[PDB]
Amino acid sequence: NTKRESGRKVQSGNINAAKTIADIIRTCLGPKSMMKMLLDPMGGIVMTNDGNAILREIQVQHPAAKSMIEISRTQDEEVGDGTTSVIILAGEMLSVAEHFLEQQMHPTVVISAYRKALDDMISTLKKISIPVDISDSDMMLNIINSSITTKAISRWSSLACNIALDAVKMVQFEENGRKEIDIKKYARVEKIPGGIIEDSCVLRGVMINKDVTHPRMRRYIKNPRIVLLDSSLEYKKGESQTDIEITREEDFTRILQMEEEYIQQLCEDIIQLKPDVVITEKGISDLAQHYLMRANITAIRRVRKTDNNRIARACGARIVSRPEELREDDVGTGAGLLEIKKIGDEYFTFITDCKDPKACTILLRGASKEILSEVERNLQDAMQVCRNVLLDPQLVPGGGASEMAVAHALTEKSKAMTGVEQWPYRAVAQALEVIPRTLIQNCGASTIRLLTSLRAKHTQENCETWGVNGETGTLVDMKELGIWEPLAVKLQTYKTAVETAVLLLRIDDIVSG
């Protein structure tokens, strides 16, 4: 085979896909937003402020259109937000940097300006980031309710945060409150379909929707005995294999019922004793579980052992192979609230596990199951900023003034750095400042004179702390204004942002095989 691919063409299409994806999303960003409306090839219109929702549902292409969703999803999972930032940030840095610098003709110094810009960004952030109280849900509120209003929804600003505020503090880890690492199986959210925000509240603990699914199961018995498999209901659920006949057509019906008839005995030895809770990680079959529901033994299934282990201890338990076999005794109850709410016919068991790693599946409701989601989507980013205020009490104010706060701090380091690297490090600098400018050009007038006033403001007044208002454009204080760009969320978007553009730098060439 004879093939080679040359230089700018990919790099262009990179920069092309880089900035284009950034365009509407960065205008969808901010207190003054926009909307990205897809029109499906079928004729269906899809209008979402998140192009990640738009692009994945539409054509995804071999260039950075392939590499934008990966780093968006990389930005999706970790903190939970910044989803719209990376693609507007990566599309921001690559364009302004590369071309001029590839007109200066060099990949390498461009690569370094990222790590150069990374620390100053870390620097002036961590400097001008403002520590806010971890234990004050109000001092949490103003920083956490700022990150809710970020994308499409200020609706759950109070409510999701309020439900998110204390829960995350009340979470812990395996390594310990919640804080530390990012574990979102301690951030968990399970929906209550329908319901109401009043029926909703802060559940600082975990719910198991599958703990009590029926009124027959154990309910409101507050010293639980959770049991892991091994004897009462054994690891093996296999057939009894009694009087099986390969020569009989009637035996085909027998062998499938025979699986659960042995499981019948498995949940029956639960009846013979009745540890008030039963968990099975491979799940229990129904015919046996009807007998569980006869004994008021809540049947926990299709939620993990680690999940149940974190829930058991946090709700309390003594695990046994079988209650007639006591391995050792543990505490009876680890929780203060065992609550089963019924919305629909489904019973939702909310066990508040206070200061517990648990699964922290938190009770939340919207008026209906759909806006129920926007609790979580905000709760996530709320619990994100909840864990963030725990993770990083110090987190920046900004309307994107941080994106200036770095850029001029870059520039004033860039002026201090000089070299050829000055230019990339500055060509990386002026990129950052279009992000908040788009927020305040959505505001109107001259957003440059604003940036003038901004970079006037920068060393004059403040950089990110005394900021620019995303709904106004004037020089303000985002702390005073109560708007907060979380330090982790800030830095995290950038760590994810700097790399993809470096990849797009690295790639002048692809293959078909």
Binding site: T20, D23, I24, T27, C28, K32, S33, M34, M35, K36, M37, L38, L39, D40, P41, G43, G44, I45, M47, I54, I58, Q59, Q441, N442, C443, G444
Partner: protein
């Protein structure tokens, strides 16, 4: 693939809408017309009402998807304004268009709107006066709400029957009529007409001289599954276990018919005592001639083919319990219609279930030999029913014929939103979509949507006068005296469904295929 961005995506949006919208503007007030609608089926439909035209077919654009959305709002949430709701948005769009034709942000002009809607909502509260739900006070609302929806003369005879239907209430107070709608379309010498016939009406009743056409004292066994099986809530075989068993059931099937009449002939005397009280079995399938006669001969009225709705409205109307069997039932559950009256009109029998013990269900008898006439008259009814039902649910009433809009556009007198003037323009933009009803009519009717409205404006600027373009000749008057008075349910909601979708396109800078 490809996309559209900037004002290019915007232009496609704002053009497609106002390209579709003015097509709908052909119809409003009585001086509108009935727009020919042929969907893929081939049937012609003539409607001045929005929901029909909007939800059947559309010239396909990305905007055509959202227009039926807020069209699914107006008819749902109100039912009056479906005709009116469409004409508002593009008139506002062309306004905002001017500002972005000047050039400006669709975001800043977005912020220039909803306050004005919120203002007008206030102003709508202001200018309106709460009015009686009295029948004749409703008429001036009834005709108009009908007449803004559908042409006058139809709306004029509808004005009577619709109010007669919405005043038929037991004081079940709704925006619409669910039960008050029972529509009987009849082939008749009247091509367009609706007859008000009180009480539940049955799809049919069976003829026989011994079968009582007049049942004043009704003990109603609701009857579905036919005579041909014994104690059966569904018809199914007691036989057919082999090939020759096919002959045996039909040989024994005539037995159950006599068994079933045997039940009904005794169940009459059981429940009714003597035969003077007509025992009513409304048999929702065909009654077999023997039991058709033998129930007749015993005095039981065996009625052929009611409806599942006439079964459920019966459960409502008669205050008794329905059944799917003809079985002997305890005399308690048997329905009582204070009148069960089979009514042969033309060749068809319509059995009245009257003295409804819940007369929330009345019946309208629709007239036409030609379905195209018979469909259209059916169509004008119900959109105006809920429209005039929005008259008798509303103790507040808003005077129509542009009385309230000049009380806004003028009383919106600017620099009240002085800040950037973008609201002062946006309210101006919003002020200019208010008058489409004074516009479209003096448009449709005589003179000018403009040269008459200037009087309306002026004559309102005169003496604060309630004034408006005629629904009929398009000339000034006092719209309070005329009695043209819009449902209080319309006005508020009529505004909401506009500016919310008028907000979206502005924030939509992007479209992809």
């Amino acid at each position: 693939a490809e996309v559209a961005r900037a004002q290019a995506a915007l232009a496609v949006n704002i053009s497609a809408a106002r390209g579709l919208q003015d097509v709908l503007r052909t119809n409003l007030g009585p001086k509108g017309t009935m727009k020919m609608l042929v969907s893929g089926a081939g049937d012609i439909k003539l409607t001045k009402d929005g929901n029909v035209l909007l939800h059947e077919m559309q010239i396909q654009h990305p905007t055509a998807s959202l227009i039926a959305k807020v069209a699914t709002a107006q008819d749902d949430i109100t039912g009056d304004g479906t005709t009116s709701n469409v004409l508002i948005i593009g008139e506002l769009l062309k306004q905002a268009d001017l500002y972005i034709s000047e050039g400006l942000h669709p975001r800043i002009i977005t912020e220039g709107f909803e306050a004005a809607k919120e203002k007008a909502l206030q102003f709508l509260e202001e200018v309106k006066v709460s009015r009686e739900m009295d029948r004749e006070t409703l008429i001036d609302v009834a005709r108009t709400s009908l007449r803004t929806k559908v042409h006058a003369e139809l709306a004029d005879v509808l004005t009577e029957a619709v109010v007669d239907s919405i005043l038929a209430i037991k004081k079940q107070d709704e925006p619409i009529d669910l039960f008050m709608i029972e529509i009987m379309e009849m082939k008749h010498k009247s091509e367009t007409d609706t007859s008000l016939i009180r009480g539940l009406v049955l799809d049919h009743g069976a003829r026989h001289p011994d079968m009582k056409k007049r049942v004043e004292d009704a003990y109603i066994l609701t009857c579905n599954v036919s005579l041909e099986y014994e104690k059966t809530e569904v018809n199914s075989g007691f036989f057919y276990k082999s090939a020759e068993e096919r002959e045996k059931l039909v040989k024994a099937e005539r037995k159950f018919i006599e068994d079933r009449v045997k039940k009904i002939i005794e169940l009459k005397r059981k429940v009714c005592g003597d035969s003077d009280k007509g025992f009513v079995v409304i048999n929702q399938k065909g009654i077999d001639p023997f039991s058709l006669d033998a129930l007749s001969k015993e005095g039981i009225v065996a009625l052929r083919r009611a409806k599942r709705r006439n079964m459920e409205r019966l459960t409502l109307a008669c205050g008794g319990v329905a059944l799917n069997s003809f079985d002997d039932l305890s005399p308690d559950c048997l329905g009582h219609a204070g009148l069960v009256y089979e009514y042969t009109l033309g060749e068809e029998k319509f059995t009245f279930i009257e003295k409804c013990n819940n007369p929330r269900s009345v019946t309208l008898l629709i007239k036409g030999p030609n379905k195209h006439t018979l469909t259209q008259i059916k169509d004008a009814v119900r959109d105006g029913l809920r429209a005039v039902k929005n008259a008798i649910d509303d103790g507040c009433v808003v005077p129509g014929a542009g009385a309230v809009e000049v009380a806004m556009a003028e009383a919106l007198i600017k620099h009240k939103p002085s800040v950037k003037g973008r609201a002062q323009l946006g309210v101006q933009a919003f002020a200019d979509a208010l008058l489409i009803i004074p516009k479209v009519l003096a448009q449709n009717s005589g003179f000018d949507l403009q040269e008459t409205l200037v009087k309306i404006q002026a004559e309102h600027s005169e003496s604060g006068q309630l004034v408006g373009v005629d629904l009929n000749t398009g000339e000034p008057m006092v719209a309070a005296e005329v009695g043209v008075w819009d449902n209080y349910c319309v006005k508020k909601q009529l505004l909401h469904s506009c500016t919310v979708i008028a907000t979206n396109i502005l924030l939509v800078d992007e479209i992809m295929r």
